Write a protein that binds this ligand. Structure first.
Ligand SMILES: CN1CCN(C(=O)c2nonc2N)CC1
Ligand SMILES: CN1CCN(C(=O)c2nonc2N)CC1
Lengths: 240, 240
C-alpha cells in the first residue's frame, strides 16, 4: 500500500467506520491505505484481561495499564519496520490543521496510539511517542475518533484516493438543482457558462466569507494581486 | 433519553463506532443518549437511488442532491418534534472548542447533517440549518466523523454517562505502575500521600505545560491568586 497506519486501540472495531465505508473504505479495499489494529487487551496475562490501572497520587480516574499498552506498541513497531512515526492523540498535543495534515501525510508509515480513561503514563510518552497531536481543543472519551479523523484527513493526499484550504480560504457557496428552491435563486453568473467570471465569483465569495467569519485566517495569508482586488470589492459591497 | 440526536448520513453504519462501544455505547444502551439515523438514499425515487448532483457553474466535484437530503432532513425534524437545533458540520462553521461543546450540550435535541462530496446546496443551509460548526481547520471526506466527534464530546455532559479544560488548562502528567519504567521514576510527591501537595503539584504542572505548549490559552484566563503563584514558580524553575 501507499500509506500504512498501525493503530493501538481497545476498540479496534470502531475503525470499521473508516475501513468499510466511503472514500476511505475504497482506499482500503484498493490497497492504497492499510489500517492494522493491535488491542492492548490481547497483550494481557491476567484472567480478567485488565487494561486499566490506578494513578499514583490518587484522583477519580484510571489510566491505561502500562504493560499491555507498551507490549502492543512494541508489536506494532515491529510490524511497521523502519521509519514509522508514532503519534499519541491528546488535547496536550500540537493542534491539527490542514498544514499539519499535509506534514503528516508525508509519512509512508504512522502508528497511532489511542488513549482511553484519563490517558497514558507520561513516561510512555517520553519513551515510545514521537509526536503528540490534538484534533481540537475539546475533550473526547478516547483517542479513536481523533485517530480516525487523522486517517481520513491524510488519506485524501494518497494518489488515487480522490478523483478552499488549498489556499487557506473558506469554501465558496455551492448550488445544484433546482434553479429555484423555496424562492431562492441560483446566482445567474453560475448559469452563464462564463468560466472566468465563475472562477472570479467563487474566489471573491471565498474571500468575503473568510473575512466575515474567520478574519484571523486572512492575516496569515499573502494575498495575490487578484485576491486583494476581489477582497476590496467584496468589502466595498458589504459597506454599500 | 436525556439527549436525542438525529443524524442525516449516507453512511449510517459508521455511527456504530459510537453507539456500540465504550462510554458512548454504554450511554446508548442505558437510554441516556439516543442516536437515530436517516439516510438520504432511502428518500430517492429513481432506479439507481441517486444521491449526488452536478454543481451549477461547473467544477470537478459533485454536491449532495437536494431533494433526497431535504426530505431526510424534514423527516428527522418531524421525529424530533419542537425545539431541535439543526447543525451542519463543515470547515465554514464556527470552530468547536470545549466552551462550544458545553453550549451545544444544553440542547435536549440536535439534528446533525453530514455532508459528502463537495457539500450541500447553500440554499439548504439558509432554509434548513440553524447553526454551522467545524471540528477543526482541516478537510475530511465527509461530515460523519465530525458528527461522531461532536456526539462523543457532548455525551460527556449527560448525567450518568461518566463516573484540565475544566479550567482552560492542559492536563497534568499522569503516572501509574511500575514505580520505575526504563529508568524513569514517578515524581516522589505523587507517592507521598500528601493530598494538598499533590493537588498543587498537578496544578503547577498544568500551568507549566499550558505556558510552554499553548501560551495563547493562558491569555484567555483570569488566573486565581494560587494559579498566579504556581505559574510564577514554574517559570522561575524553567529559567533556573
Ligand atoms: C485519554 N484521551 C482523552 C480524550 N482525548 C482527546 O480528547 C483528544 N485526542 O486527540 N485530540 C483530542 N482532543 C484523547 C486522549
Ligand atoms: C462536505 N464535507 C466536507 C468535509 N467536511 C469537514 O471537513 C468538516 N466537517 O466538520 N468540520 C470539518 N472540518 C464536512 C463537509
Amino acid at each position: 500500500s501507499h500509506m500504512w497506519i498501525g493503530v493501538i486501540s481497545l476498540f479496534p472495531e470502531m475503525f470499521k467506520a473508516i475501513t468499510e465505508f466511503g472514500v476511505t473504505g475504497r482506499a482500503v479495499k484498493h490497497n492504497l491505505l492499510k489500517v492494522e489494529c493491535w488491542n492492548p487487551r490481547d497483550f494481557t496475562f491476567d484472567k480478567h484481561k485488565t487494561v486499566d490501572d490506578r494513578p499514583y497520587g490518587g484522583g477519580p480516574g484510571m489510566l491505561m495499564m502500562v504493560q499491555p499498552l507498551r507490549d502492543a506498541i512494541h508489536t506494532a513497531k515491529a510490524a511497521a519496520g523502519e521509519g514509522a512515526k508514532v503519534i499519541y492523540l491528546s488535547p496536550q498535543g500540537r493542534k491539527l490543521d490542514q498544514g499539519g495534515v499535509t506534514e503528516l501525510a508525508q509519512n509512508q508509515k504512522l502508528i497511532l496510539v489511542c488513549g482511553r480513561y484519563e490517558g497514558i503514563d507520561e513516561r510512555l510518552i517520553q519513551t515510545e511517542i514521537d509526536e503528540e497531536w490534538s484534533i481540537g481543543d475539546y475533550v473526547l472519551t478516547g483517542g479513536e475518533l481523533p485517530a480516525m479523523t487523522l486517517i481520513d484527513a491524510v488519506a485524501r493526499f494518497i494518489p488515487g484516493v480522490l478523483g478552499s484550504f488549498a489556499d487557506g480560504l473558506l469554501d465558496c457557496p455551492h448550488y445544484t438543482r433546482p434553479e429555484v428552491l423555496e424562492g431562492l435563486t441560483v446566482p445567474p453568473v453560475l448559469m452563464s457558462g462564463h468560466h472566468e467570471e465563475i472562477r472570479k465569483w467563487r474566489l471573491k465569495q471565498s474571500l468575503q466569507r473568510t473575512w466575515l467569519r474567520r478574519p484571523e485566517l486572512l492575516e496569515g495569508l499573502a494575498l495575490t494581486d487578484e485576491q486583494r482586488k476581489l477582497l476590496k470589492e467584496a468589502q466595498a459591497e458589504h459597506n454599500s
